[PDB]
Design a protein around this ligand. Structure first.
Ligand SMILES: [Br-]
Lengths: 74, 73, 72
């Protein structure tokens, strides 16, 4: 029966390797989700810097107009 | 009978493998999707770094007009 | 019978070996996405320092201007 035994052995080994593959996959999916979550945080930070910049540019616009006033008076 | 049961097991294994192969195919797509989103970011940063350059130069010039005014009054 | 079974087993083993290699690649691709993602909070922090510097420069400029207007 050693031919059949060898077969049943190889089968067990295959089932065992599958189990481990299914588990590596479940990990991989969480890693991807971990990377997905970080990626999503970025835009809000960029957006916030962008509002800050617009507000600086506004304040500089006004400053330039105050200076223009002062020049014309002196 | 011993053989029949080996044959069913082989059938199930091939089936589990078929599913695995579809899950991997899907995982790749999602890793390529994350490369796509990650990759927009650098250009965004550069656009900001350019506005900051503009701004630092406006300020320098402002500081210099102010210095000239202070000498005139 | 046995010869068919043996041949299918060999196919399955080489399918599994291929899957294990694809998994190994995928893990490297994920780790490299990770790295790129982690370089971002640094870039954002440096910008934020520049912005702080600029807002402090503006505050001071507004002060200079307010004092000029008092004199004239
Ligand atoms: Br990823």
């Amino acid at each position: 029966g050693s031919g059949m035994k060898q077969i049943e052995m190889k089968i067990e080994e295959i089932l065992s390797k599958i189990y481990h593959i299914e588990n590596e996959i479940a990990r991989i999916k969480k890693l991807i989700e971990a990377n997905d979550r970080e990626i999503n945080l970025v835009p809000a930070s960029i957006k916030q810097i962008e509002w800050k910049i617009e507000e600086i540019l506004s304040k500089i616009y006004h400053i330039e107009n105050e200076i223009a006033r002062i020049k014309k008076l002196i």
